[PDB]
Design a protein that fits this description.
Structural class of chain A: alpha+beta
Number of strands of chain A: 10
Pfam family, one (chain A): AAR2
Subcellular location (chain B): Nucleus
Organism (chain B): Saccharomyces cerevisiae (strain ATCC 204508 / S288c)
Order of helices and strands of chain B: EEEEEHEHEHEHHH
CATH topology of the largest domain in chain B: Nucleotidyltransferase, domain 5
Helix content of chain B: 25-40%
Strand content of chain A: 15-25%
Distance between the termini of chain B: 35 Å
Oligomer: heterodimer
CATH superfamily of the largest domain in chain A: Aar2, C-terminal domain-like
Strand order of the largest sheet of chain B: 7-6-1-4-5-8
CATH architecture of the largest domain in chain B: 2-Layer Sandwich
Shape of chain B: globular
Structural class of chain B: alpha/beta
InterPro entries (chain A): AAR2, AAR2_C, AAR2_C_sf, Aar2_N, AAR2_N_sf
CATH class of the largest domain in chain A: Mainly Alpha
Order of helices and strands of chain A: EEEEEEEEHEHHEHHHHHHHHH
Number of strands of chain B: 8
Protein name (chain B): Pre-mRNA-splicing factor 8
Number of domains of chain A: 2
CATH topology of the largest domain in chain A: Serine Threonine Protein Phosphatase 5, Tetratricopeptide repeat
Radius of gyration of chain A: 20 Å
Chain lengths: 300, 237
């Protein structure tokens, strides 16, 4: 069970750790988060009390190094940093734990929510979507634009999601225009799965990461990417049965975890109505259709 | 974006553009079967592709053989239309390629956009205008060449005959839209108006009667009267 210690909390901030969140007062004796489950990626996120604009945060994996947070009063944010000195780190965390200055990652034993949301998400894939190779952890915020969004303006600070475009030469084989546009199986299976992702695990990982960036930061480009990856599978007549079963599970947990009051901006009416009621896969997503109908019948 | 009353003059500028109308591509007679069920029998159709500036009509005849063994024909018709328009643009030399294609029906936008991905500089546009191009099959010589076709065929026409010798495109397009609106609203009345006077003939190389300028004013007046009457009857006003 790993720890992300904090130097201090000099500004009042709502702190997120995965699907949990804590309010910390200005100069409250807070020294971080302990008992973080090993084996999953995690995200630690921040909304300042003084500026509910810019949600921002850090994707990290405690197996990859010793990470701490320190407020930077120049850039005005909580920064993730790596402590390379293993014994300095253990010694700081030991003191903070002894003084009970750390909140405990509040996982219920029965609860597989985080595993279910992050099943296919790997730090190595996150770091290729979010390029800052000198760090082992990945910064994301509300404002970051996607490579695709930038094509339609600072490349370094972009989310490099796989570009999906249903009206592109990549998506449409010459002489298969109607066939490829109305049945995207070619684009899903050959171009994206075999060509670019190599397997459905990498595809699902990016889809899951896009959702979590949409949900935790209100990142609009991430939400576009999540919907595009759902729609590409749903609009394909030919999908491996195991992919359809797993997609149903993934979407079920995403819809279960979504805050009820964000469904209006985070869920695309057209995509969901098309995926659940018109598409090739309209009958392949039992769990997802039942939770959407019982939780968001207005959107449909 | 959309072509409307506001940007109407753009049709007659020096940017090559084509209107594409797909309303006569897939045509059926609905009939009873021996068992008292309903079946369709397709008849020959056409894509109506028109340069509104020059009057050049690229009438691609859609022979019933193209539907043989195919499903969802109203959807295929849109894609077949886009394939033929794409083929036509690729067959034209570069300097003759349209800079814009305006579809009369919004359902044509995605099929045409997908077929024209090789032409990212050709803008595909809808219109808010209710253009009467569906009445193209009320022009006898166009109807005749469509119904006689025994195979796929492209036939080239000037839908303005020789009018551009005497009037501007703008005026030629207004006359065409008035004749087609009349033919669409009451085909019998409109055809009566156009042929009644036997001294006025259609030249072998023309679609419409050889009217003097004064005879056109009279004809145009009779067409507006036809259109307003039928509109009264439609809406008891």
């Amino acid at each position: 069970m790993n720890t992300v210690p904090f130097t201090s909390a000099p500004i009042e901030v709502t702190i997120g750790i995965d699907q949990y969140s804590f309010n910390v007062k200005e100069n409250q004796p807070f020294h971080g988060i302990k008992d973080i489950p090993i084996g999953h990626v995690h995200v630690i996120h921040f909304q300042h009390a003084d500026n509910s604009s810019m949600r921002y945060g850090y994707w990290f994996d405690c197996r990859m190094g010793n990470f701490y947070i320190q407020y930077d009063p120049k850039d005005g944010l909580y920064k993730m940093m790596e402590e390379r000195d293993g014994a300095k780190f253990e010694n700081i965390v030991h003191n903070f734990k002894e003084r009970q200055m750390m909140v405990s990652y509040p996982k219920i034993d029965e609860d597989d929510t985080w595993y279910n949301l992050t099943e296919f998400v790997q730090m190595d894939k996150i770091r290729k979507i979010v390029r800052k190779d000198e760090n082992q952890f990945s910064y994301v915020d509300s404002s970051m634009t996607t490579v695709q969004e930038n094509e339609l303006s600072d490349p370094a600070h972009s989310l490099n999601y796989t570009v999906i475009n249903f009206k592109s030469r990549e998506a449409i084989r010459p002489g298969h225009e109607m066939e490829d546009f109305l049945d995207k199986s070619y684009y899903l299976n050959t171009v994206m799965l075999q060509g670019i992702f190599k397997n459905s695990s990498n595809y699902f990982g990016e889809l899951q990461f896009a959702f979590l960036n949409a949900m935790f930061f209100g990142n609009y480009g991430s939400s576009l990417q999540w919907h595009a990856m759902i729609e590409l599978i749903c609009s394909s007549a030919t999908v491996p049965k195991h992919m359809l079963d797993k997609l149903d599970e993934i979407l079920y947990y995403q819809i279960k975890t979504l805050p009820e009051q964000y469904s209006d901006i985070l869920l695309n009416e057209r995509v969901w109505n098309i995926c659940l009621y018109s598409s090739f896969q309209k009958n392949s997503l039992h769990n997802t259709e039942k939770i959407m109908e019982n939780k968001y019948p207005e959107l449909l | 974006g959309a072509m409307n009353s506001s940007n109407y003059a753009e049709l007659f500028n020096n940017d090559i553009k084509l209107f594409v109308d797909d309303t006569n591509v897939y045509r059926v007679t609905v009939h009873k079967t021996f068992e008292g069920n309903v079946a369709t029998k397709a008849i020959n159709g056409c894509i109506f592709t028109l340069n509104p500036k020059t009057g050049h009509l690229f009438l691609k005849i859609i022979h019933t053989s193209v539907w043989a063994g195919q499903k969802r024909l109203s959807q295929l018709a849109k894609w077949k239309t886009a394939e033929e328009v794409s083929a036509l643009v690729r067959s034209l030399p570069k300097e003759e390629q349209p800079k814009q294609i305006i579809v009369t029906r919004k359902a044509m936008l995605d099929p045409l956009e997908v077929h024209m991905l090789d032409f990212p500089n050709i803008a595909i546009r809808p219109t808010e205008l209710r253009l009467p191009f569906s009445a193209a099959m009320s022009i006898d010589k166009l109807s005749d060449v469509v119904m006689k076709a025994t195979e796929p065929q492209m036939v080239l026409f000037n839908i303005y005959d020789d009018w551009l010798d005497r009037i501007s495109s703008y005026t030629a397009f207004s006359r065409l839209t008035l004749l087609l609106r009349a033919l669409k609203t009451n085909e019998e009345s409109a055809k009566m108006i156009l042929l009644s006077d036997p001294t006025i003939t259609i030249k072998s190389y023309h679609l419409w009667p050889s009217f003097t300028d004064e005879q056109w004013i009279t004809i145009e007046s009779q067409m507006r009267d036809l259109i307003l009457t039928e509109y009264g009857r439609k809406y008891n006003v």
